[PDB]
Amino acid sequence: GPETRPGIYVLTSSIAHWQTLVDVARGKFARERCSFVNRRITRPRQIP
Amino acid sequence: VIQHLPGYGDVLSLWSRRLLVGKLGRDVPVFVHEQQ
Amino acid sequence: FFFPVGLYLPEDRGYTTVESKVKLNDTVRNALPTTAYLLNRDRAVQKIDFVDALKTLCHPVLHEPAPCLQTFTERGPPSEPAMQRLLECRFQQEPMGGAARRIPHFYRVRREVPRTVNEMKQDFVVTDFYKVGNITLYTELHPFFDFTHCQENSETVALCTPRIVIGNLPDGLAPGPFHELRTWEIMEHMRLRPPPDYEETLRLFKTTVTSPNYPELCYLVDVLVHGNVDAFLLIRTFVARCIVNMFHTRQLLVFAHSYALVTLIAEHLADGALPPQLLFHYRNLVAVLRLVTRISALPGLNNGQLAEEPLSAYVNALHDHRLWPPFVTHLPRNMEGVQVVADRQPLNPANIEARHHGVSDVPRLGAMDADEPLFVDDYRATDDEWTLQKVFYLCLMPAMTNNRACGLGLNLKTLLVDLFYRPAFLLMPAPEDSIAAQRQAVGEMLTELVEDVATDAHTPLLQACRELFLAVQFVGEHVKVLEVRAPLDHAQRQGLPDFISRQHVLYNGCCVVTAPKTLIEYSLPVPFHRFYSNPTICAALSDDIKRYVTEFPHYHRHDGGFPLPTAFAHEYHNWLRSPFSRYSATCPNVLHSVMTLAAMLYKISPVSLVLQTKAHI
Amino acid sequence: METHLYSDLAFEARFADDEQLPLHLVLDQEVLSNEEAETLRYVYYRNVDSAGRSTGRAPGGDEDDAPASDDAEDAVGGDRAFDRERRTWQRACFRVLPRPLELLDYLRQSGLTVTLEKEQRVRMFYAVFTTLGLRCPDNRLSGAQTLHLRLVWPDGSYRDWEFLARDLLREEMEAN
Amino acid sequence: VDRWIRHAAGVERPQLLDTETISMLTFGSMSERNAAATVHGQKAACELILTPVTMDVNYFKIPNNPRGRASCMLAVDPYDTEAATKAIYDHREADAQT
Amino acid sequence: VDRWIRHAAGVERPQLLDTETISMLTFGSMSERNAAATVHGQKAACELI
Amino acid sequence: DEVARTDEWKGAGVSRLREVWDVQHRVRLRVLWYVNSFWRSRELSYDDHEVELYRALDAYRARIAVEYVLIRAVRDEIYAVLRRDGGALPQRFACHVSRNMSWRVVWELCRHALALWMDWADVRSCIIKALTPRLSRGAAAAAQRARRQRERSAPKPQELLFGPRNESGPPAEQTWYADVVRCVRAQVDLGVEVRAARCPRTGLWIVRDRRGRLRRWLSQPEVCVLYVTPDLDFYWVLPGGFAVSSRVTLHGLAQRALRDRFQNFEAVLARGMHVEAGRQEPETPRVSGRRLPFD
Amino acid sequence: SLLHTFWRLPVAVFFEPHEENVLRCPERVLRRLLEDAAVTMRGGD
Amino acid sequence: VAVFFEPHEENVLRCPERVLRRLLEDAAVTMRGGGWREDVLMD
Amino acid sequence: KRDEKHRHVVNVVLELPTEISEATHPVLATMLSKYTRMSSLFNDKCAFKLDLLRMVAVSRTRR
């Protein structure tokens, strides 16, 4: 969007090891990651 | 050119979007029934 | 616990252990069961029908034979010699251009042909099919697919194909009378339980199509018209005279062999010019086609479309544009997946050139012997007429004629010149002399063709033969054997997506029932299908086929086991294959067997299962 | 879909150094069967000069031009010649859609606003997306150039066929 | 056609399985949810296998193996796996039962 | 005709060797192997007149 | 504030679609053109002078030429060595022979087989499969090792008594690729693979399938069969195990085109295949549509 | 025309035809084979 | 009982002169005909 | 000139009997205006004969 409004979630999972949880979070949140890269390119004077 | 218009009786809208994003390089969609 | 649903006890052994306690209505629903009833936790009766079975029958895994093919390949070809004599079989893909010219060249070799596994599977009666004495049983792995071994490059590999229509099932798995009873079930659901009494027209059709005394010129005009409406309009007055004279001189109905002639007569000659009884016979034949068309679909439940294709096409193969009639004279208006093969590669749209009459168009007449270019009328067959032609050729003909028909072509380029090129035809104003002078001037062969077939006191022989001559402007070309290559519908594709169905049709030719003796010198035969491959006609027409048949007297069988030329013999990739020839060999000559061949066509697709099951069929 | 965009950007990057322009392809059931389209592993492409050459070899000539020796020891210059042959082949990105689809509807469901010269529907039982390059030694591009397309499957089998650049560019370049 | 089939039978849309690690962590998915009400007992899972229309009806009036050939392992000789597989699969032999 | 009738009947050829056949005629031998499995009793083969 | 190339790319879209056939008209495929492509901005020029086109088609003819001319060289060797021997064929493949047979008819069948095989020549034939492993990198090293190993003095008693055991020699089981042609019905088989061995009693050859079963065709009067060794040695056989011997003179071709047409293409690592050389590959990747794709 | 055999005296054949190869030649069958092959070869600028 | 010659490396099959002449004449005709398959494909 | 070519196309290709001439058939002359165009196809004379035959048929219809 034009400016960043944040998303909030509380989630339950059976995964304990951190990197596996980060892997699954990346898998489900790929749109947000691509949006972050898009923010980095589209407004170079700003650094999220 | 226009399929549906409010009170009248969208290829034009998306085509204008493509031409205007080619020109501007900014995402401001101007639909036929949205802006003036 | 385990319990059966919808079994079918043999009718050879019908018996009633109880008669005094129970008696049922004579509806075929009681004759052929389709439900099972079981007791609940407490003594209450519950109903299980195939509609509840649909939750599992329609699941994709049942229609996925890939692991079955893998384990079949790993099990390998059986080694015992009894299996070995069944094992040997060979197929070859061939170009289609020379396929019509080379038939005598193929038949000249005195070699036998091994019977395919599916053909061998039919011979056993049902109660012997399960016994260990059956060799071919190991191949019967799945109800919806065939499995077989084949040889190419001197190695043995496994081949798989899908049973496009339920009729494909082997005789031991579903006996012939069972199909009759399911046809009765279809009729009772459609509430046509007493069939419309077209029976006398069917008896006359039987006696006229099986008669060896069929007039020879019937094939010539059938080639000449092509079924083109304007061509038939010119001859229409000749047709009426010929038909009335033939019916009076012989009680056999003329011009009944070809669908185009039948339907063109039924519409156009209805204007008049005929004794009403013969026109009634033809309209009754067309009505039989319409009735069996109504039986083919499920009009009560049939509604909607899927993937821009009609649900009827999913239900029954008679509505698929992917199934062509064995004899074709007009290209269908619908072609999406179908590829038409005239030579080594499928035809691009540019190669299909338009045939326009009147104008000289000489290079086409020069290149009639050619293979690559395919000539069409500036015309297409509508889908309803497509269905009617398909059902007339596949359904009615081999049922009523007991598979005695055959395909032949006429050598038009020399035949029409040798017939008409007398100066009597070339000089004609924009007769009356004497019969001897007329016969001398017209040409003796045309005389023996026409002498008493199409002349009356109102029109002597010369006027009639000039009348037939006038239509020559629609001459056409020689015969060709076309290959139709198509993948199945979007649902049947799911199992074996790579699979391609290969089918053969004959273009610009006749379906005949007897040898034209005068035309024997000019004509050539071409047996090409599991139908229309009677060896008697072929042995009569060509010396090489007679030599081949007299070397192997057993092959004389009318039941479709007669070896086709190897370019045609792709039995596993045809839609129709072995059961319909074997059934046509024994079936009685009544309307019921005709309609049975059509109801037997129902497709195996899961969507077809859904539609059939919802009807409770 | 993403393969076309990524390959376009990558060829934009590499054009300044090796001068290849990108060509975008889509293939359907007339090309390859569903089984081999489902298990597709590698796609390879090559360019040829008009007189008959390759992109990797020295344009003037090479020792490979010599006749085969049919000797026992080195059949055809084994290691060096095989290295050259693998050098001349080039790899490209690919994505395959195994589900059946039609081009125009799929593109409109994507961000691309397709507006063809006519809305010709095409139905493909399975689709693979691929981008290939054809090189021009300078900004002069010759229509007589031939292009190679190779497909590779895990078991080592391969199929290939050649195109004429004049057919691919028959009207698109004629406008420019 | 997939959607049309999913509508024809009262079955829900397809659902991906859990991955290897999650499958090892969690002991089962129990896809078929518990029904709202049940007066009769536990829903008897009725499975269907395909059968020719002309099977011998006498097959059912006796206690029987519902896969055509009997395969009781007290019949074959012990530990002769080749002979056991011959008895259960090798179709050219004369089978047990009828 | 012997080959064809043997195939149609479902019984194998006389694969027997010379020393085993002379022993089989004079002594007798187990020329039939055991069946794969038996849920019923001995193969009490019927004799047909 | 500016957008990335991706968004203006997707907005601009495509507008053209063309269908193109390959040179042989075997396969047809489509091409897409994107209006926003940098290819448009470059403004390069295009021309197709006819002499370049003629050169291109002549070179293409020379490219497809590689295998048919090799078949014809095989023909030339067969006829030349038949003339050189003068009509004498020694027996080479183990099978019995009958004297009171009309050998003229089997000679005529050999003529017919020779005529029929050549009409059905194709890249699928045996000799292409024979050259297939010869071109790979391992072939040169293997040939070098084999020549060094076979050209060796008998070990002294010293070497036999101490140290390494007798160094392994070549196995009898050889691999051949073959064409077989049947004349009784005019049809050919061209992509056969066959096992071979030398009979211990007499030095003739025995032919077997990869399943181990002994092969039958050598007896059949109507068949003549073609063999080629993995070291490009050549045999033609007619019924009775009588053979013609020559070496495939492949020197008629330039190495460039011969390597260009075909080779056993070596792989590079992709998802799922082992990093260590020669390990057993896991289940195939197979991005599939029969199943819901994994994510 | 007749071949030259190494062994001065021939030997009796035995064993089934799948462990050693022997050719058998009915003269009538061979004549039919020759005629059929010759015809079909022709059958198949 | 039938009789056969045992195969050996030395026994040789003769060729009649007329058949060899026919083969050589066919070889010459095929060589000078120029019926190359590649030319058919290019045509 | 034209006489030799027309004599060929009349008496060798089409092989009309001498009693049929140009003055007897207008359609035949209007067709020979076309037939002389192509110098090939002078071996499959049956095609030309059938073409003239069907041309007469189409010329004589009352529609």
Swiss-Prot record, chain E:
Organism annotation: Human cytomegalovirus (strain AD169)
Designated name of the protein: Major capsid protein
Subunit structure, as described in the record: Homomultimer. Makes the hexons and eleven out of twelve pentons. Interacts with triplex proteins 1/TRX1 and 2/TRX2; adjacent capsomers are linked together in groups of three by triplexes, heterotrimeric complexes composed of one molecule of TRX1 and two molecules of TRX2. Interacts with scaffold protein; this interaction allows efficient MCP transport to the host nucleus. Interacts with capsid vertex component 2/CVC2. Interacts with the small capsomere-interacting protein/SCP.
Membrane-spanning ranges: none
From-to range in the entire protein, with total length: 1127 to 1224 of 1370
Domain of life: Viruses
Cellular compartments annotated: Virion; Host nucleus
Described function: Self-assembles to form an icosahedral capsid with a T=16 symmetry, about 200 nm in diameter, and consisting of 150 hexons and 12 pentons (total of 162 capsomers). Hexons form the edges and faces of the capsid and are each composed of six MCP molecules. In contrast, one penton is found at each of the 12 vertices. Eleven of the pentons are MCP pentamers, while the last vertex is occupied by the portal complex.
Protein family per UniProt: Belongs to the herpesviridae major capsid protein family.
UniProtKB/Swiss-Prot annotation, chain G:
Domain of life: Viruses
Ranges for region Disordered: 146-171, 278-295
Localization: Virion; Host nucleus
Stretches that traverse the bilayer: none
Family statement drawn from the similarity comment of this UniProt entry: Belongs to the herpesviridae CVC1 protein family.
Job description of the protein: Capsid vertex-specific component that plays a role during viral DNA encapsidation, assuring correct genome cleavage and presumably stabilizing capsids that contain full-length viral genomes.
Subunit-structure text: Interacts (via C-terminus) with capsid vertex component 2/CVC2.
Designated name of the protein: Capsid vertex component 1
Species this protein is from: Human cytomegalovirus (strain AD169) (HHV-5)
Gene assigned in the entry: CVC1
Included stretch of the parent chain: 298 to 592 of 594
Swiss-Prot record, chain I:
Region feature (Interaction with major capsid protein/MCP): 1-37
Signal peptide interval: none
Lineage: superkingdom: Viruses
UniProt-annotated location(s): Virion; Host nucleus
Family: Belongs to the herpesviridae CVC2 protein family.
Job description of the protein: Capsid vertex-specific component that plays a role during viral DNA encapsidation, assuring correct genome cleavage and presumably stabilizing capsids that contain full-length viral genomes. Participates in the interaction between the capsid and the tegument through interaction with the large tegument protein/LTP.
Subunit-level organization: Heterodimerizes with CVC1. Interacts with major capsid protein/MCP and triplex capsid protein 1/TRX1 at the pentamer vertices. Interacts with the large tegument protein/LTP.
Name of this protein: Capsid vertex component 2
Curated annotation (Swiss-Prot), chain J:
Location in the cell: Virion; Host nucleus
GO cellular component terms given for this protein: host cell nucleus; viral capsid
Keywords: Capsid protein, Host nucleus, Virion
GO biological process terms, semicolon-separated: viral process
Subunit text: Interacts with the major capsid protein/MCP.
The family this protein is said to belong to: Belongs to the herpesviridae small capsomere-interacting protein family.
Stated role: Participates in the assembly of the infectious particles by decorating the outer surface of the capsid shell and thus forming a layer between the capsid and the tegument. Complexes composed of the major capsid protein and small capsomere-interacting protein/SCP assemble together in the host cytoplasm and are translocated to the nucleus, where they accumulate and participate in capsid assembly.
Name of the molecule in the record: Small capsomere-interacting protein
Residues of the full protein shown: 13 to 75 of 75
